[PDB]
Each structure stands twice: as C-alpha cells, then as structure tokens.
Amino acid sequence: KERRIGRLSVLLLLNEAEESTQVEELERDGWKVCLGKVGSMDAHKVIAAIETASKKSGVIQSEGYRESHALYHATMEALHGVTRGEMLLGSLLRTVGLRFAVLRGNPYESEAEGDWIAVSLYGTIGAPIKGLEHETFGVGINHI
Amino acid sequence: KERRIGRLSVLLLLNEAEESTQVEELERDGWKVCLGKVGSMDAHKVIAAIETASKKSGVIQSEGYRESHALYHATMEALHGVTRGEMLLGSLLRTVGLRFAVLRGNPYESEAEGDWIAVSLYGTIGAPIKGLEHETFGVGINHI
Amino acid sequence: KERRIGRLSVLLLLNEAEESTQVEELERDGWKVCLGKVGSMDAHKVIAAIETASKKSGVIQSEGYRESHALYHATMEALHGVTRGEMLLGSLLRTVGLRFAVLRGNPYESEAEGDWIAVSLYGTIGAPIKGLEHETFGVGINHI
Amino acid sequence: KERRIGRLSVLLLLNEAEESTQVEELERDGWKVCLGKVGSMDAHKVIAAIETASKKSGVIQSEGYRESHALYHATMEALHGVTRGEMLLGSLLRTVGLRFAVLRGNPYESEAEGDWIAVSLYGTIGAPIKGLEHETFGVGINHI
Amino acid sequence: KERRIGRLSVLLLLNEAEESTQVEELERDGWKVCLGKVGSMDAHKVIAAIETASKKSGVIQSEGYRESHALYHATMEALHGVTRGEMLLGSLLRTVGLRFAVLRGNPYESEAEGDWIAVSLYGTIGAPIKGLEHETFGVGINHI
Amino acid sequence: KERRIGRLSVLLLLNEAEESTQVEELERDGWKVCLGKVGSMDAHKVIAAIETASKKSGVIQSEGYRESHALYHATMEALHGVTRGEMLLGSLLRTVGLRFAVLRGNPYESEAEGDWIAVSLYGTIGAPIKGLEHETFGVGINHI
Numbered sequence: 001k002e003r004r005i006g007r008l009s010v011l012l013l014l015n016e017a018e019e020s021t022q023v024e025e026l027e028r029d030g031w032k033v034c035l036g037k038v039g040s041m042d043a044h045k046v047i048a049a050i051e052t053a054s055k056k057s058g059v060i061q062s063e064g065y066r067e068s069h070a071l072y073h074a075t076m077e078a079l080h081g082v083t084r085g086e087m088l089l090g091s092l093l094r095t096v097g098l099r100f101a102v103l104r105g106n107p108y109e110s111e112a113e114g115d116w117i118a119v120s121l122y123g124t125i126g127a128p129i130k131g132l133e134h135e136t137f138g139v140g141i142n143h144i
Numbered sequence: 145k146e147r148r149i150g151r152l153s154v155l156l157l158l159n160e161a162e163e164s165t166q167v168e169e170l171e172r173d174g175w176k177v178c179l180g181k182v183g184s185m186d187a188h189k190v191i192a193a194i195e196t197a198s199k200k201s202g203v204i205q206s207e208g209y210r211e212s213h214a215l216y217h218a219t220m221e222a223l224h225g226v227t228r229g230e231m232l233l234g235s236l237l238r239t240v241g242l243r244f245a246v247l248r249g250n251p252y253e254s255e256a257e258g259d260w261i262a263v264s265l266y267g268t269i270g271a272p273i274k275g276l277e278h279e280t281f282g283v284g285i286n287h288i
Numbered sequence: 289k290e291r292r293i294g295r296l297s298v299l300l301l302l303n304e305a306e307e308s309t310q311v312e313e314l315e316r317d318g319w320k321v322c323l324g325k326v327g328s329m330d331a332h333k334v335i336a337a338i339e340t341a342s343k344k345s346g347v348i349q350s351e352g353y354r355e356s357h358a359l360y361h362a363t364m365e366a367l368h369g370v371t372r373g374e375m376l377l378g379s380l381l382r383t384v385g386l387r388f389a390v391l392r393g394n395p396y397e398s399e400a401e402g403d404w405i406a407v408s409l410y411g412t413i414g415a416p417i418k419g420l421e422h423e424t425f426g427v428g429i430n431h432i
Numbered sequence: 433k434e435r436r437i438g439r440l441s442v443l444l445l446l447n448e449a450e451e452s453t454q455v456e457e458l459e460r461d462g463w464k465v466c467l468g469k470v471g472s473m474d475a476h477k478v479i480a481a482i483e484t485a486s487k488k489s490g491v492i493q494s495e496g497y498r499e500s501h502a503l504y505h506a507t508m509e510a511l512h513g514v515t516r517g518e519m520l521l522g523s524l525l526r527t528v529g530l531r532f533a534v535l536r537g538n539p540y541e542s543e544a545e546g547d548w549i550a551v552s553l554y555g556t557i558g559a560p561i562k563g564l565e566h567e568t569f570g571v572g573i574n575h576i
Numbered sequence: 577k578e579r580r581i582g583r584l585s586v587l588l589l590l591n592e593a594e595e596s597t598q599v600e601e602l603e604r605d606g607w608k609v610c611l612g613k614v615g616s617m618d619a620h621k622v623i624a625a626i627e628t629a630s631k632k633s634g635v636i637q638s639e640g641y642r643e644s645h646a647l648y649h650a651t652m653e654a655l656h657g658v659t660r661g662e663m664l665l666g667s668l669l670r671t672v673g674l675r676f677a678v679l680r681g682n683p684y685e686s687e688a689e690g691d692w693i694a695v696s697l698y699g700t701i702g703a704p705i706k707g708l709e710h711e712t713f714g715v716g717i718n719h720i
Numbered sequence: 721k722e723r724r725i726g727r728l729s730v731l732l733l734l735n736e737a738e739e740s741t742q743v744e745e746l747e748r749d750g751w752k753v754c755l756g757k758v759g760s761m762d763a764h765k766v767i768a769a770i771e772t773a774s775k776k777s778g779v780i781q782s783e784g785y786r787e788s789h790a791l792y793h794a795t796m797e798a799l800h801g802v803t804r805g806e807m808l809l810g811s812l813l814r815t816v817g818l819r820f821a822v823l824r825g826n827p828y829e830s831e832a833e834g835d836w837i838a839v840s841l842y843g844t845i846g847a848p849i850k851g852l853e854h855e856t857f858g859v860g861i862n863h864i
Contacts, residue, residue: 298446424438
C-alpha cells in the first residue's frame with residue numbers, strides 16, 4: 001500500500017504550477033481536497049479559515065464533533081511545525097502568509113473505513129523591506 | 145521561478161522520481177545539493193549521517209564548526225519536526241526510515257548577505273500495530 | 289498504604305448515584321471535597337469556577353499562592369486529558385458540559401504533612417441534534 | 433441508566449470489587465468486556481497486551497485491521513493519558529503496574545450508526561524516592 | 577572555551593549589588609546587555625517589554641525576523657521555568673515581579689559568527705500581606 | 721541583605737570561586753548547605769545522588785519521608801528545568817555534567833511557619849556535533 005496522504009498534501013501545497021489540475025486528479029481518486037490561504041499564523045484564525053474552507057468544499061460536513069476534532073488536531077499538529085515549535089509566537093507574527101491544503105480519504109486499498117485527514121501548511125514570513133525572510137512547514141495527519 | 149530554498153528542499157525530498165535531473169537543475173542553478181537516508185530517528189545518529197553525507201559533497205566545508213553548527217541547528221529543527229510528540233511515546237526500537245535532502249545556496253531575493261541551508265526530512269515510522277505506518281515530516285532552515 | 293486520592297476523586301465524579309452521601313463519607317475521613325459543573329472547557333473559565341467553588345467549600349483557603357498553585361496545576365493536568373491533549377481546542381469546544389471533583393488531604397497514614405490535592409474532570413461533548421457524541425476524562429494530582 | 437461506554441469503562445476499571453458481577457451486567461446489557469493488567473508502560477508492550485487480551489474474548493474480531501486499528505487509537509489516547517509528561521521524565525526502568533478495561537458496544541443514544549470502543553487505564557508508577565507511588569489515569573474512546 | 581552566556585545572564589540578574597558596573601564590564605567584552613523589570617508573567621507582556629527594552633538598548637536591531645525570533649524563543653524557554661511549567665497560569669499570576677536580563681554575543685573565542693542570545697528571568701511571586709511567597713527562575717539560550 | 725533561599729541557591733551554585741567562604745557565611749546565617757555534582761541527568765540517578773549527599777550533611781534528616789519527599793519534589797521541579805525539551809530529544813547516552821546546590825533554612829520574611837528547601841542545578845550537555853555544549857539550568861523550591 002502506498003497512498004501517502006501526507007506526502008500528497010504537501011506536494012499539492014508546493015506544486016502551484018497547476019494545482020487546478022491536481023485537485024481534480026486527486027478528487028477523482030477518492031480524495032476530498034481543499035486549498036486555501038490565510039494572512040496570519042494565529043491558531044484561532046487558521047482553524048476558523050480551514051474549517052470554513054473545509055465545510056464549504058465538502059471535505060468535512062458542517063456539523064459533527066468527530067470530523068471537526070480530526071481537522072482541528074491535524075491542523076494543530078501542522079501549526080507546531082509552521083510556528084517553529086512556538087505556537088504562541090505565531091500569533092505575534094506579523095506580515096506572514098499561510099497556504100494550506102487538506103486531504104481526506106482512505107490511506108490504503110482496504111475499502112474498509114480507513115478514513116484519514118491531512119493538513120499541510122506552508123508559511124512565508126516576510127517583512128515590508130525585502131519580502132521573504134524565512135519559510136516554515138507543518139503537517140498533521142489524523143484518522144477520523 | 146522562485147529561489148525558495150525551503151520549498152526546493154521539500155520538493156527534492158518528496159519527489160524520488162528522477163532525483164538526478166531535479167538535482168542537475170538545482171546544481172546548475174547555483175545550489176549545493178545532498179540526498180541520503182537513515183534508519184535511525186535518534187538525534188545523534190541522524191545528525192552524524194547528515195553532517196557526514198553533506199561534507200563529502202560540496203554542501204558544507206569540512207573545516208570549521210561555523211558551517212557545521214549551522215547544519216546542526218537546521219537538522220535539529222527538522223528532526224524536532226519528525227519527533228512531533230506522538231512518535232515520542234514511541235521509545236521502543238522501532239523501524240524508522242528517514243530520507244533527507246540538504247540544500248545549501250543563496251536565497252538571492254534582493255541582497256546576498258550570505259548563504260542559506262535547508263534540511264528536509266521524510267520517513268515512515270512503523271506502528272506497534274500490524275499493518276500501519278506513520279508519516280513524519282520536518283524542515284529546518286538556517287543562515288550559514 | 290492505600291488512600292488513592294486520585295481513584296477516589298474519579299469515583300466521586302462518576303458515582304452520581306448518591307454523591308450527597310459520598311461527600312460526607314469522605315468528608316469525615318480527613319478529606320476536603322468539592323463537586324461542581326462548568327459549561328465550558330476553556331482553561332480560564334474552568335480554573336475560575338474550580339477556584340471559586342474550592343474556596344467557598346473550604347477545600348482551599350481564600351488567599352495563598354501555595355494552595356492556588358497546587359489546584360491550578362492539578363487542574364491544568366486534568367484539562368490536558370479532557371481536551372484530548374489539545375488545550376487550545378477545548379476553548380473552541382461549544383455545547384460541552386464539564387463536571388469536576390476536588391479532593392484534599394493525606395494520601396497516607398503518616399500523620400505528617402502529606403497534603404495533596406486531586407482534580408478529577410468528566411467531560412460531555414454534545415451537539416444540538418442528539419446529545420452525547422464523545423466523553424473525556426482528566427486527572428491531576430499535586431502535593432500542596 | 434445511561435449508555436455511556438466511557439463512564440462504564442472507568443467504573444469497571446476503578447472498581448476491583450466483584451468485577452464478575454459488574455462484568456455480568458455489562459455483558460447482559462449488550463456490551464463486550466475485557467479486563468487485564470500489564471507491568472509495562474511501553475507503548476509497544478501495552479498495545480500488544482491489550483490487542484491480544486481483547487481478541488481472545490469477543491471484544492474485537494481477530495481478522496481485519498479495521499477493528500484492530502480502532503483499538504490501537506483508543507489505547508494510544510488512553511496511554512497518552514498515562515504518560516502525562518512528568519512520568520515522561522521517568523525513563524529509567526521503573527515498576528509500573530497498569531490495569532486496563534476494554535468495553536466495546538453501542539452507545540445507543542438515538543441512532544445506531546455502529547459500535548464504539550473504550551479503553552481505560554489505571555496503574556501506579558513507583559517514584560525514584562522510597563515510599564512513594566504516582567497514580568496514572570487514561571481513557572480513549574473510538575468509533576469502530 | 578568558557579564564555580557561559582547563560583551563567584553570565586543569570587549572575588547579572590541576581591547580582592544587584594553593582595549591576596551598573598557589571599553591564600559595562602560585560603559590554604566592553606563583546607556583549608550586548610539589557611536589564612529590565614516587568615510587573616507581570618503573562619507571555620505577551622513579557623515579550624513586548626523585553627523586545628522594546630532590547631531594541632532600545634541595541635541588543636537587537638529594530639526590524640528583522642531573525643533576531644526577533646531568537647529573543648522570542650529564548651524568552652519563551654525561560655518563561656517555562658519562571659511559570660513553573662505552566663505558561664497559561666503565569667498570566668493568571670497577580671502581584672508578581674519579573675526581572676529580566678538579555679545577553680548577546682559570541683559564546684566562544686572563534687571570531688566566526690557564533691552569535692547567541694540568552695534571556696535570564698527572575699520572578700518574585702508575592703501577596704498583599706507578607707511580600708515574598710515564592711521565587712522562580714528561567715533561562716533560554718538561542719543562536720541568532 | 722535578603723533571606724531569599726532561591727536567589728542564594730543559584731548564587732551558591734553559579735559561583736565556584738571560594739564556595740568555602742560562601743558556604744561559611746550561609747551556615748553562619750542559619751542555613752543548611754550542600755553542594756555536589758552528578759554525571760547523569762537521569763531522574764532516578766540525580767534524585768538518589770542529591771538525596772544521599774543532602775542527608776549526609778545536616779540538610780534533611782535521614783529518618784522520615786516528610787523531609788525526604790520535600791527534597792524529591794524540589795529536585796524534580798529543578799530537573800524538570802534541566803530537561804527543558806530540546807535536551808529531551810537527546811536520549812542517546814550523552815556526556816552530561818550536573819552540579820547542584822541544596823539550601824535548607826527558613827525564609828524568615830515575617831513569620832516562621834517552618835523551613836524551606838531549594839535545589840539548584842547547573843551543568844553542560846554535550847552536543848551530537850563536535851565542539852558544542854548546551855547549558856542547562858533548573859531551580860526547585862519547596863516547603864518542608
């Protein structure tokens with residue numbers, strides 16, 4: 001079995017070449033995809049943005065603690081990577097872009113309910129002068 | 145075309161297909177490259193392997209602790225990413241297969257203060273449960 | 289010695305059969321008991337509710353950093369369990385009941401000052417539709 | 433009478449007295465039960481013991497990874513609870529005695545989507561100091 | 577090599593005898609010093625106070641993610657010590673003094689860029705009645 | 721002149737020069753002292769060494785667990801400080817040299833409820849990278 005939901009989510013996040021085509025390629029292969037961008041690294045904002053863009057994309061249904069809890073946790077896991085192990089400081093981070101991806105589906109060929117979600121995050125921390133000063137990555141993977 | 149060493153690091157790491165050509169273009173574009181793999185997630189083990197495999201090539205200069213230390217911190221941040229926390233509850237001699245990519249060059253955004261160095265980690269940790277592996281991911285960027 | 293202050297606090301928390309009788313049974317056996325309920329899983333709210341209900345019950349005296357610090361820490365420890373390792377998310381948790389217990393006294397027969405406190409928490413995370421969707425537990429034990 | 437699998441799990445775990453009758457009533461009420469004990473806090477060790485002791489009885493079906501994996505995650509969450517963090521500073525071959533309770537059935541609240549599975553852990557970790565043991569507690573609930 | 581930037585920062589923090597003379601002694605020895613005091617243990621406040629007093633003292637230049645990130649992290653590291661492993665609670669801590677020190681320079685004789693920063697923090701947690709009830713310490717050391 | 725046992729602890733610990741005179745003045749001022757050193761960062765190892773070296777002198781009375789336990793908790797808090805978290809990723813038999821200072825007396829601020837006990841830790845952990853050591857620091861204060 002080689003359906004790396006994590007690897008996938010990160011590749012979708014970086015391959016901005018033709019993400020339009022990638023999302024469908026993956027969509028038809030039993031995946032629920034969602035790409036988005038947030039201009040903050042504050043935990044609450046990121047979650048709200050991801051959640052919204054997740055429900056509005058059918059990646060997660062509008063109500064249900066179960067799925068929200070999974071997205072939330074995978075998201076939190078990935079935020080620890082993008083904020084460089086300092087959650088609290090991500091909030092303080094000004095002038096920062098965050099691109100996110102979220103994949104949901106079976107991590108393997110077993111038709112059985114093996115339903116996982118992956119939240120990949122790509123951060124660009126820049127300043128008014130130059131533009132990019134430091135990049136950050138994060139990945140969270142949880143079963144639903 | 146962007147000169148994002150981090151993004152490049154992960155793309156190089158995450159695309160096993162024709163790493164040869166991917167590496168050729170990177171070397172051809174003023175980047176020093178270095179790929180590898182390690183069966184240990186142990187700090188000591190990972191850092192030795194990386195430091196060694198990087199010096200052998202033209203990544204860092206085997207001479208002063210300056211470039212060496214810069215590699216260490218980038219690798220630590222990267223490892224700190226692979227050793228999320230749940231994998232931390234996994235202290236029982238497991239089958240861990242890490243693959244790494246090291247990229248050293250200059251994010252020539254505007255100025256060329258100096259060189260930068262990125263370390264990307266990706267592998268799969270076996271689960272104590274049969275037929276189950278976890279994906280781990282980590283990135284560490286530092287200024288030489 | 290078998291005075292499990294933790295085991296006790298959890299049993300008091302679940303045995304809603306006749307908690308009225310349990311509290312006295314334990315009260316007379318050198319214990320300072322306190323039961324309460326909070327309609328949130330946000331750290332600050334829980335602490336404020338527990339603290340208040342703790343002082344007003346004589347389980348902790350109104351002023352004194354020492355005792356507050358112990359209750360606070362045991363509480364924090366138990367919150368990590370009830371929020372399923374995700375403090376921050378407990379705050380975001382809507383429609384959620386939290387029942388708490390707090391015991392204070394000697395964990396053993398040594399009349400010497402062996403004074404500990406235990407905060408047991410039982411969480412019920414429900415939604416407007418059904419009612420219960422997931423339960424959570426947490427326990428914190430600190431010496432004063 | 434409530435059908436809270438979690439609450440039941442902990443009550444079964446925390447009441448050693450006449451577990452026989454407690455188990456009888458649970459089995460008689462459409463629940464699959466399973467008790468045990470383990471002298472290791474090591475993930476690998478705990479999960480093996482639990483998975484094995486649960487399959488032997490009618491908890492999960494020894495056949496597919498579906499029920500097996502569901503047991504794993506519930507046990508991990510539970511263990512993640514026993515390995516709070518202070519016990520994490522305790523990596524020196526200590527005397528740890530964990531007792532576990534596994535309950536698999538259906539929280540028949542309204543609908544019967546499917547079965548649920550809860551794992552309760554309770555034990556006592558010896559302290560590096562003479563005459564002192566710490567109580568550990570953890571619960572993990574999952575949907576089959 | 578014996579330039580203990582950490583040891584130094586703590587000694588400067590406690591030696592209130594003649595800190596006026598110490599700061600210069602160290603200033604002339606390739607160090608960027610900064611002493612300050614905050615009447616809170618809330619993460620955000622401490623960081624804002626330290627940052628401000630850090631830039632206004634030339635210990636860190638006004639703009640630049642790199643240096644801010646280092647101070648921020650060392651600060652965060654030291655706060656975990658002063659709040660006794662409970663970040664969140666430090667915020668709740670009322671009637672509390674925090675003295676801080678910050679050193680920046682080369683941790684060794686290698687003229688090469690070995691540039692680190694250390695944030696030492698000394699906390700005094702008192703009440704309206706007596707005055708001091710408990711003291712706390714924290715130290716963070718990061719390379720820039 | 722202040723009677724801050726913590727501050728004194730760290731000063732005693734951090735000043736190796738003429739510890740003899742520093743100790744003389746402390747003993748002469750109603751304080752019980754105790755210095756030492758340990759090559760292990762292992763809880764079990766550190767606590768044994770400290771507990772033993774403290775009983776030999778007039779720090780705690782080798783008789784009851786009361787003073788013994790009080791020493792344990794203070795040492796744990798202190799160790800919890802030395803085992804920050806990054807040193808936690810360092811589980812590979814490293815060269816760790818901890819030095820400790822134990823001070824037991826009475827912070828006679830106003831009242832003399834009873835005695836207090838402080839434990840200070842300072843050492844240097846070797847890095848997996850050549851020519852690099854990390855400083856560790858921790859303090860734990862407890863009421864006898």
